[PDB]
Amino acid sequence: DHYNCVSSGGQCLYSACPIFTEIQGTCYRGKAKCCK
Numbered sequence: 041d042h043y044n045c046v047s048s049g050g051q052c053l054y055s056a057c058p059i060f061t062e063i064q065g066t067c068y069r070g071k072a073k074c075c076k
Contacts, residue, residue: 050076
């Protein structure tokens with residue numbers, strides 16, 4: 041979720057992740073990805 045994602049340094053993003061991150065969970069009612 042957003043809380044776990046951003047508190048650990050990840051970003052909540054609706055589309056693909058930036059370099060050196062990958063999908064690790066979701067944000068925003070499951071609609072976005074947590075990129076970390």
